[PDB]
């Protein structure tokens, strides 16, 4: 969705 994950408190690589 438009590329808003890395920014708005969302995705981030696990581990």
């Amino acid at each position, epitope marked *: *969705h*438009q*590329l*808003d*994950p*890395a*920014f708005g*408190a969302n*995705s*981030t*690589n*696990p581990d």
Partner: antibody
Amino acid sequence: QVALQESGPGLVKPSQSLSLTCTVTGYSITSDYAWNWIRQFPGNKLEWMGYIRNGGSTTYNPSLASRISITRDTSKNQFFLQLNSVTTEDTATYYCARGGTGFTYWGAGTLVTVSA
Amino acid sequence: DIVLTQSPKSMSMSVGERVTLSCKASENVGTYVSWYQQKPEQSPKLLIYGASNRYTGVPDRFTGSGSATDFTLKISSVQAEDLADYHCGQTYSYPTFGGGTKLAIKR
């Protein structure tokens, strides 16, 4: 339009701390959008160092996380990068950029050299 | 930490030819992959965001497809002006860029 422009030290000694300053024109850094610091090493390689969010939160790169600090000055409309313990591997050209739907508006990019 | 991989490190191409670069994610990034263009002594310029969406002022000759892992970029006709490095990056987890594909013109 959006016009980012970084400034700051050009050449700095090792073990010292670096400190750039990105100044933006034509959009408040407090109303929507991610405000990033990206660096480009000599040649081809890009590295996203981190960002200061609209609310003023911070998400650094899990590897430079112990050495960097991205703060802002909401009244001057500028956010700043701070790289501590600069090793000679850290020399590269630095950019500040707007982030929403990818990285859209990039700054001219100021080159920083870490040499004795 | 989501590794992305660009294929032709470099390419030589005539004019009017059909270029096609490729970018790959290590672990499903969805459709959050974007292409940038970097000319000599210039800052990158967004080309495609959302894996398939073209930006503004970006000429038709640039189109992108791809989803979760496999992404590509096309140029219907390479022009002299289309000389530069082409990067890609995922904006899913932590932003990580590809290795850049340097594209040169065959004269």
